């Protein structure tokens, strides 16, 4: 009768009033916060009036309706935000469709340092406020972020203070967990963006696909009836948080969450330990959950898949079914694969059956289906050893800065800030997997790629530069990787021209923390790459070798800007020379 009252009682006031300002904060990302707050307590009022007579005035009205009139008595003002006030005169679901089309993923706002002392004060004054604060920043610079997962976070944040603010020294204690907390909130947007990304780009069944083959290797032990259960419930959820309907999306995540701690008998022997939690935990470590132990009566799959003398006439039957069977099996049994190998095999077994099963003598054919298979298992195999050797070699920094001379080489046309961040990102994706033990190197490796590729493709899609990056972003989410490793230098690429003062180091980089000092110097070796695209990595080596010696050098002496002044013109001209 009334879906407001129905949300507020289901979730309860807390929930429900976190849930409303992520909402409001992921839609309307430049306003500023207690124009937020405002209208989550005026409509969360009217929540608490329409649970106490739900058939009272405008309380039947729809969620976006209700929302969408109170996002408007403030989007309107057009200097602050341009297209939003064009959405407020459409009507739903029209007005919600153009609130989704418009959400900026590259906002853009000052990056928030923490101020441990006077946020400390804050969180004691008005713990509410303070937390508040939290969801707001995160939600504004992360618009697709997982509503739920950000309350689990907000929570993490308020333990961390809650923990330290008490302690003698509140800035050492802090910033360790506030920096680790930065990580995961940065993986979190990532994986839940790539899930977005799916529905809008490739649509549900790309989703269902990834999810049963990932859900497969999570919950060997669990029969396919119990698998297609939990992912038509998990493609339901994501689908409802991706497109805004928040209040719902939280909802039947608690619901989906109760359903596999009920049923964890048939699921896995590994949630004991996660059904045991608060909702917000529980949900979580479920999400996180590592893989079960492999039953040990797993079938023979060559006998069904490739054998069987009647596959054809089982497939058109019903393919999708047969084709999820076929990636539940499969995905089951290789939890050394990473996902999108698997979705690549499952996509190259249906290409072998389309094919096969126009042909005369259908079984001959695809006889020999599973020795396709093979290549496509080496490739990434042979990258992951390639990196993890490099990485181990020269190390994080020396490792980015080999990415970034790859990736420079590949596309030039993209900005040298996001070509610097692609390779510091994938730098830190072999820091992390390299270390593991070597069967969970592949899947941790490639799952992360896939999400660094997916940012780098939303990045792309609102700053378009490459027709090759447009390309392999567009055609499908399994051969991403493939058309990305494939990509090489234009032919006819035209070197940038040459610009001295690209290349001209000053006192000002003494004063940069050595992360910040990197990124400077990483910037730099882009550039050199853009203007000497032919030139090889051991002269780009030497080359910022010699710029990292200057820098060190002028920043330790007792002039430094003079000797910035006589030793920075010398280097940008030798320089030029060692790159011919
Ligand atoms: C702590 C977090 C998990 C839940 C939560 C819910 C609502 C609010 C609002 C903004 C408030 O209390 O003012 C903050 C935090
Ligand atoms: C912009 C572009 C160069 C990004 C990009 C391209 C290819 C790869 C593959 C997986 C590799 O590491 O060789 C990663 C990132």
């Known amino acids: 009768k009334s879906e407001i009252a129905h949300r507020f009682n289901d979730?309860?006031?807390?929930?429900?009033?976190?849930?409303?300002?992520?909402?409001?904060?992921?839609?309307?990302?430049?306003?500023?916060?207690?124009?937020?707050?405002?209208?989550?307590?005026?409509?969360?009022?009217?929540?608490?009036?329409?649970?106490?007579?739900?058939?009272?005035?405008?309380?039947?009205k729809s969620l976006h309706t209700l929302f969408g009139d109170k996002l408007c008595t403030v989007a309107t003002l057009r200097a602050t935000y341009g297209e939003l006030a064009d959405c407020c005169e459409k009507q739903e679901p029209e007005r919600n469709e153009c609130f989704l089309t418009h959400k900026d993923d590259h906002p853009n706002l000052p990056?928030?340092?923490p101020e441990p002392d006077a946020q400390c004060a804050a969180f004691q004054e008005d713990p509410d406020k303070f937390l508040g604060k939290y969801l707001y920043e995160v939600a504004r610079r992360h618009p697709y972020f997982y509503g739920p997962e950000l309350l689990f976070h907000a929570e993490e944040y308020k333990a961390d203070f809650t923990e330290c603010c008490p302690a003698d020294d509140k800035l050492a204690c802090l910033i360790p967990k506030l920096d680790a907390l930065k990580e995961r909130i940065l993986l979190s947007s990532a994986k839940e963006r790539l899930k977005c990304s799916s529905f809008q780009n490739f649509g549900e069944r790309a989703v269902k696909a990834w999810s049963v083959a990932r859900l497969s290797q999570k919950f060997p032990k669990a029969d396919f009836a119990e698998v297609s259960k939990i992912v038509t419930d998990l493609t339901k959820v994501h689908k409802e948080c991706c497109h805004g309907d928040l209040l719902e999306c939280a909802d039947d995540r608690a619901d989906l969450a109760k359903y596999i701690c009920e049923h964890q008998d048939s699921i896995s022997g590994k949630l004991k330990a996660c059904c045991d939690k608060p909702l917000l935990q529980k949900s979580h470590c479920i999400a996180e959950?590592?893989?079960?132990?492999?039953?040990?009566?797993?079938?023979?799959?060559?006998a069904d898949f490739a054998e069987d003398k009647e596959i054809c006439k089982h497939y058109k039957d019903a393919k999708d079914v047969f084709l999820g069977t076929f990636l539940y099996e499969y995905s089951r049994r290789h939890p050394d694969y990473s996902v999108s190998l698997l979705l690549?095999?499952?996509?190259?077994?249906?290409?072998?059956?389309?094919?096969?099963?126009?042909?005369?003598?259908?079984?001959?054919?695809?006889?020999?289906?599973?020795?396709?298979?093979?290549?496509?298992?080496?490739?990434?195999?042979?990258?992951?050893?390639?990196?993890?050797?490099?990485?181990?070699?020269?190390?994080?920094?020396?490792?980015?800065?080999?990415?970034?001379?790859?990736?420079?080489?590949?596309?030039?046309?993209?900005?040298?800030?996001?070509?610097?961040?692609?390779?510091?990102?994938?730098?830190?994706?072999?820091?992390?997997?390299?270390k593991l033990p070597e069967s969970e190197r592949l899947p941790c490796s490639e799952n992360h790629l896939?999400?660094?590729?997916?940012?780098?493709?939303?990045?792309?899609?609102?700053?378009?530069?490459?027709?090759?990056?447009?390309?392999?972003?567009?055609?499908?989410?399994?051969?991403?990787?493939?058309?990305?490793?494939?990509?090489?230098?234009?032919?006819?690429?035209?070197?940038?021209?040459?610009?001295?003062?690209?290349?001209?180091?000053?006192?000002?980089?003494?004063?940069?923390?050595?992360?910040?000092?990197?990124?400077?110097?990483q910037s730099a070796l882009a550039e050199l790459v853009k203007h000497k695209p032919k030139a090889?990595?051991?002269?780009?080596?030497?080359?910022?070798?010699?710029?990292?010696?200057?820098?060190?050098?002028?920043?330790?002496?007792?002039?430094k800007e003079a000797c910035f002044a006589e030793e920075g013109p010398k280097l940008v001209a030798s320089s030029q020379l060692a790159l011919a």
């Open 11 to 60: 979730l309860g006031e807390k929930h429900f009033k976190g849930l409303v300002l992520v909402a409001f904060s992921q839609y309307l990302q430049q306003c500023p916060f207690e124009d937020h707050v405002k209208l989550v307590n005026e409509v969360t009022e009217f929540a608490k009036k329409c649970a106490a007579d739900e058939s009272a005035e405008n309380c039947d």
């Open 111 to 113: 990056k928030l340092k």
């Open 289 to 302: 959950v590592k893989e079960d132990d492999l039953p040990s009566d797993l079938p023979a799959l060559a």
């Open 344 to 434: 690549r095999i499952a996509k190259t077994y249906e290409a072998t059956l389309e094919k096969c099963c126009a042909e005369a003598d259908p079984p001959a054919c695809y006889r020999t289906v599973f020795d396709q298979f093979t290549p496509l298992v080496e490739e990434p195999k042979s990258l992951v050893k390639k990196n993890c050797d490099l990485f181990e070699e020269v190390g994080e920094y020396d490792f980015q800065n080999a990415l970034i001379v790859r990736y420079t080489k590949k596309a030039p046309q993209v900005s040298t800030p996001t070509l610097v961040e692609i390779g510091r990102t994938l730098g830190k994706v072999g820091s992390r997997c390299c």
């Open 450 to 521: 896939a999400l660094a590729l997916n940012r780098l493709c939303v990045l792309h899609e609102k700053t378009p530069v490459s027709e090759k990056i447009t390309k392999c972003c567009t055609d499908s989410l399994a051969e991403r990787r493939p058309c990305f490793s494939a990509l090489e230098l234009d032919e006819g690429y035209v070197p940038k021209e040459f610009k001295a003062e690209t290349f001209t180091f000053h006192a000002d980089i003494c004063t940069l923390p050595e992360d910040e000092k990197q990124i400077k110097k």
């Open 536 to 559: 090889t990595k051991e002269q780009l080596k030497t080359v910022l070798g010699n710029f990292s010696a200057f820098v060190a050098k002028c920043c330790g002496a007792e002039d």
